Amino acid sequence: GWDMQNVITLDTSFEDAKTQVQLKKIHSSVILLYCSKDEAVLILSEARS
Amino acid sequence: LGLTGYDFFWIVPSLVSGNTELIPKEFPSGLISVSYDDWDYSLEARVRD
């Protein structure tokens, strides 16, 4: 009985475009993150921000 | 953050709604506010009172 809230795809720039808005609609849950390490560092830094 | 829409009714006091002729573009429509009347309660009525 999984509860898959949403699917997020940050195709464009992370800290510039509308991507942040998507990252802002995530609530307290488990985040399955799939990306390369170089950009995963940026994604996790933005998530901490 | 998705907190503005048809379901959220932001209600704010006269402190932010002063100077009604100037409206920032980031104020959502339907922003309920209360203020001292400047339309019906005229200046002559003010002086007379």
Side-chain angles (χ1 to χ4, degrees), chain A residues 24-25, chain B residues 1-2:
Chain A
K24 275 173 180 182
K25 73 214 180 182
Chain B
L1 203 64

Side-chain angles (χ1 to χ4, degrees), chain B residues 16-46:
Chain B
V16 310
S17 59
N19 192 21
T20 54
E21 275 86 36
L22 162 63
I23 302 167
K25 65 178 72 66
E26 303 103 302
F27 279 174
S29 305
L31 177 84
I32 297 169
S33 176
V34 298
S35 67
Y36 205 50
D37 44 357
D38 296 359
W39 299 274
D40 293 330
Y41 189 74
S42 178
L43 191 69
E44 321 277 19
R46 269 156 156 146

Side-chain angles (χ1 to χ4, degrees), chain A residues 1-2 20 25 29 36 38 40 46-47:
Chain A
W2 302 97
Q20 300 221 30
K25 73 214 180 182
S29 62
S36 43
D38 312 326
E46 199 71 24

Side-chain angles (χ1 to χ4, degrees), chain A residues 9-14 17-19:
Chain A
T9 302
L10 312 178
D11 81 355
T12 176
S13 195
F14 316 139
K18 190 250 182 163
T19 61

